């Protein structure tokens, strides 16, 4: 690619004086060439900034920002979260965004991603996409991800000298939706000064445990293992518990998934029909200390949580395939149900006839339209959590009206094309 592998780059290291930096303070910046940056005539930069990890230690992270040629005013920050879905450093979004084709997780940056970030830049929004997994690549570690994203937004504000009351919106799907919901959940306590006006996420993993039990032993069982890997990297007490119980097969498998170049496509292809419990000497692994307690912390479902879960009050759009075969629908429906009961403002779009990858496209145009409405202060008034399948041209403007001819044609060409997961994308409308 345009830069060396992150493993070979001192930009992806925490400096010794990291404790002198405030949360979201920029340590370093560099100009980078990106596919999206070239396509939209927007300057892209990488920011090394200070953030906080799960163990509450000061650490560095990297985010990619795009500066629109003609910015909207007042300043609007669009925070985009990718479905990285891996536990290796070079799977980082920042590296995948670069011009080049050899990045192992390149696929996460070339399908619907350029359309979304492209659209935001054409609106004049400043765009930030953080490496939400951090330098340890702790996949599905909620506190790690949420804090990294919120500091990433702070980093862009600091870098571009944007006003303290700049409007913020967040968007993501799949693994990116987990990162997004966690950022919105931690915003009140960790980053209350951020003017978050809206959020939009779909195919959302809201419970680490429920996603694990859903995926384990099936064709996408690699993500169950990746989740175990990522949580362990974020929780040292879980790491030690699992390592002591790993058999010979388990020890080599855990090393493999954390190895350089092992990213989303490798996770998909390598571990179909893997039972994660065959890697340890205990089937009751999840119900035991300290794992049971950690899983009660690594959820935004109040019924499962061992803490009081935040209820973001700003307008939100949440979509999901009811028949989702990768990220379970019911935990996400329960989350919406719980949030609405405690006073959330959620536009809920469950699709009765869809899959994980087809709902990714079905909810895209409505997602972006909702975000523009959140920025303009014109989100529709709905009964919280009432099922309204969102359809471009019916419940929102058409793909061409929202995206323009160029980006809508790019979205239409995704129909029948292989995704990161191997499954094909479908049409814009169900």
UniProtKB/Swiss-Prot annotation:
Its EC number is 3.1.1.3. Monomer. Hydrolyzes triglycerides, with a preference for substrates with short-chain lengths (C4 to C8). Has the highest activity with tributyrin (C4), followed by tricaproin (C6) and tricaprylin (C8). Can also hydrolyze vinylacetate (C2) and triolein (C18), but with lower efficiency. Has no activity with tripalmitin (C16). GO terms for molecular function: triacylglycerol lipase activity. This is Lipase A. GO terms for cellular component: extracellular region. Changing residue 173 to A: Reduces enzyme activity. It comes from Moesziomyces aphidis.
